[PDB]
């Protein structure tokens, strides 16, 4: 409630204001990259981004309306998707590169340093290329990221409960209204509007895919003692198994 009262413009500004900062890596270029060290950098970064994500989620209209139990489930389910969509957004203006941080800009060949990671880099890069081709806007991005937060875990929640799901879907609908409203303002025809809406939402399917693969990769790195994961990271990873 109140989130359902928000106008399209209010929804946008709220999400824009909630945006988390861009963090720096602890990358030291005095030592050469190893599979272990690169995994260390990336997971260290992810861990610090998580803390900001959690606080970002609280500023997403309607999120704090949910039970603490449902908030946990949503973030547990969507955290890697959210990290990924932010990554591809940061990397849009860097063709062939992934901007994990202003001081950490990696190409696919650097992904080869870690076993099985380049396949994930390739997928992320293709997603970044797709966004670039669609000329994705900042306002559209923040809408997509909030959709991922609310949608990814909603299907895996009976009691009421049934009310938690309905509230989530109401807010999702409001963001749909917001996206369309944004496209209309941008001058897109009515037809172009629902076509672009579909294009953007279908990309979330590939982002889900990347998350699933990334979770399996991160898990295998853990099970081989390649990198020591933070307690928070271990718990987020544990939620998917």
């Amino acid at each position: 409630s109140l989130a359902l009262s928000l106008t399209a413009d209010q929804m946008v500004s709220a999400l824009l204001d909630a945006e988390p900062p861009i963090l720096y890596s602890e990358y030291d270029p005095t030592r050469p990259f190893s599979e272990a060290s690169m995994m260390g950098l990336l997971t260290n970064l992810a861990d610090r981004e998580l803390v900001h994500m959690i606080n970002w989620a609280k500023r997403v209209p309607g999120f704090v309306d949910l039970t603490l139990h449902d908030q946990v489930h949503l973030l547990e389910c969507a955290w890697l998707e959210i990290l990924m969509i932010g990554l591809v957004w940061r990397s849009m203006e860097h063709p062939g590169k992934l901007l994990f941080a202003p001081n950490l800009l990696l190409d696919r060949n650097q992904g080869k340093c870690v076993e099985g990671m380049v396949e994930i880099f390739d997928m992320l890069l293709a997603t970044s290329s797709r966004f670039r081709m669609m000329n994705l806007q900042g306002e559209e991005f923040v809408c997509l990221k909030s959709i991922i937060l609310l949608n990814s875990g909603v299907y895996t929640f009976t009691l009421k409960s049934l009310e938690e799901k309905d509230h989530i879907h109401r807010v999702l609908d409001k963001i749909t209204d917001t996206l369309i409203h944004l496209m209309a303002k941008a001058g897109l025809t009515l037809q172009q509007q629902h076509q672009r809406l579909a294009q953007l939402l279908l990309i979330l399917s590939h982002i889900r895919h990347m998350s699933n693969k990334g979770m399996e990769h991160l898990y295998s790195m853990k099970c081989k003692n390649v990198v020591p994961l933070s307690d928070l990271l271990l718990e987020m990873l544990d939620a998917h198994r």
Binding site: V51, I54, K58, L68, Q71, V72, D231, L232, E235, M236
Partner: peptide
Amino acid sequence: HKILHRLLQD
């Protein structure tokens, strides 16, 4: 512990 649970409260 549940760090996520706690972080959400803080």
